[PDB]
Every structure is written in C-alpha cells, then in structure tokens.
C-alpha cells in the first residue's frame, strides 16, 4: 500500500479548511494573538458562509492560473529510507484486510442478541465506544454485523454508538513486506498582501494539529516535524510581488506489499523406519 502523502494532504485540507473558515468563533481563537486590524480584515474577507472571497488549494506547475489573492500550494519534496526490519517483514495476517473505518450504528433487537450493522464486512473489530464486553456477553462478529447477547443489557435496545472496524476482502492469509520511509513535503501560502499570508500560515498550523487526531494520521502518518522558512517574495516580475512563507512537513510511513501464502499444511502422517 504505497502512500501518496500529497493526496492525503489535499483530502484532509479541503474539507477541514472550509469548515474552519465557515465559523467565526474558531477563527478568533486561532487569530487570538494577531492585532485587531489584520484579524478582522481577514475575517471580513474569507470568514463566514457568506464570504465572497474564497481560498483555493492546488499542486505545483498547473497550466491554468491560481487565485493569487489567497492560495495553498503543495509540492512533493524529498524522501528517504530510515529503518528496516529482518527479511523486510512488517506483519503477518490471516485475513486480507483493507482500510480501517469508523462507523456509527444503532443497536437492533434480535431474540437472543442486540446487533449493530455496518456498511461492509467487519473483519477485525477494534473497539465499540465505551463498551467492555464481558465473556457472558459473548461478543462475536458475523458478516457485516457485530452481536452481543441481550440479557442484563435490556435497557440498550436503542443504544447509539460509534464502531471502529476494518475492511475484510479475502480469507487468503499472507505476509507483509516493506520498510519505513521518512518523507518531506512542502506547503506554502501565497498572496500579494503579506498580512494575509501570515494569517493564512497560522490557520494552516491549527489544522495540522487537528490532523494529529485523525485516523489516517494516527495509524499511517506519524511523527510530525514542522519547519518554517522566511517570508520571501516569490515573484518580482509583475505589477506587485507575491509573498509566501514556505513550510516543510515530515512524515514516517510504511511502503508495504502483500505476499500471499498457499502452502497450508492440513495433513500430518508419521511413519516409522523399516529397520
């Protein structure tokens, strides 16, 4: 599962950034340090659902024009290998497993059990929110649903819960081969007005923090290391310069591959020496 860090940044940034700019209360917390003049002018421009101006994000070397009033620019950056493992082995699995998901569900009333239903086959369960199923509950999984017994849990026919689970594909057990990669990626905000750039960079730092709690970040992209450059004129051949402070993001992740095993031993016969 080769990880495209650049795609992950875009997937996380685009929704979360829109949400942050949507409300004003969060922005005030973010821009608490800045002076009144810069803070409100930025808020007057981009903040709120009724903002006429809008921010954009894209990758480098596009053949079209970007909104140079305010824009996030990304470029892939360097990559390095840091740590290996014996035989390049990472893990062994009895089931072909995909991504790890979080889903919300409501308990359903069966005869002997209360069951939750999920959009896909459960495979490996990880956690149901704030439930410590005892052995007498007899927690078990079946297809796309998870079940626990009804008795002495009868108040919970309407229980509303979140579920963390994995996507199951096949029963073909296999090994993992791969290593760890230390990758760096560059991000920069652009504007023809320096004050906007500083506000824009500060907004970015917050959502990077929020990404530390994300499922993908916690499981796949770990050990953030942020580095900020000096504010510089990106462009000078024009009616006015473009100013932007580049930032560098570092990640640790695994470049993994699945190796499938077919040599399943089932029979075992003992024969003594003829002598």
């Amino acid at each position: 599962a080769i990880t495209s860090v650049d795609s992950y940044l875009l997937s996380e940034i685009k929704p979360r950034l829109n949400t942050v700019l949507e409300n004003c209360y969060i922005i005030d917390e973010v821009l608490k340090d800045f002076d009144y003049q810069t803070r409100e002018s930025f808020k007057e421009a981009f903040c709120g659902k009724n903002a006429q101006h809008e921010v954009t994000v894209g990758f480098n070397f596009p053949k079209f024009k970007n909104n140079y009033e305010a824009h996030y620019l990304i470029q892939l950056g360097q990559g390095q290998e840091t740590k290996n493992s014996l035989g390049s082995i990472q893990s062994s699995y009895f089931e072909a497993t995909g991504d790890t998901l979080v889903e919300s569900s409501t308990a359903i009333r069966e005869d002997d059990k209360l069951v939750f239903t999920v959009s896909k086959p459960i495979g490996e369960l990880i956690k149901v929110e704030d439930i410590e199923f005892a052995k007498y509950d007899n927690l078990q999984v079946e297809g796309n649903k998870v079940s626990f017994k009804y008795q002495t849990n009868e108040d919970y026919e309407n229980y509303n819960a979140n579920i963390i689970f994995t996507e199951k594909k096949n029963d073909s057990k296999g090994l993992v081969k791969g290593f760890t990669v230390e990758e760096q990626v560059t991000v920069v905000g652009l504007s023809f007005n320096v004050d906007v750039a500083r506000c824009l960079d500060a907004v970015l730092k917050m959502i990077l923090i929020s990404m530390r709690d994300s499922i993908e970040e916690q499981q796949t992209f770990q050990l953030q290391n942020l580095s900020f450059g000096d504010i510089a004129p990106i462009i000078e051949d024009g009616d006015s310069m473009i100013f932007g402070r580049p930032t560098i993001i570092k990640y640790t992740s695994s470049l993994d591959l699945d190796y499938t095993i077919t040599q399943d031993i089932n029979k075992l016969t003992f024969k003594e020496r003829k002598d």
């Binding site: 140079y68 023809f192 462009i235 024009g238 009616d239 006015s240 473009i242």
Partner: peptide, 25 residues
Amino acid sequence: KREDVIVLQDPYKVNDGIEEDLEIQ
C-alpha cells in the same frame, strides 16, 4: 506593465448627456 496578478475594474467615468452622432439644424 500589464495588470494580471491584481486586477481592478474599469474606472467609473462621469457620463455626459450629449447624444453621440447627433444631427443639428
């Protein structure tokens, strides 16, 4: 130099009521 990085709309010019291409006698 041309204006491409920042663009402002055309200026609001005060108009005159005189009809153009007016015939007189």
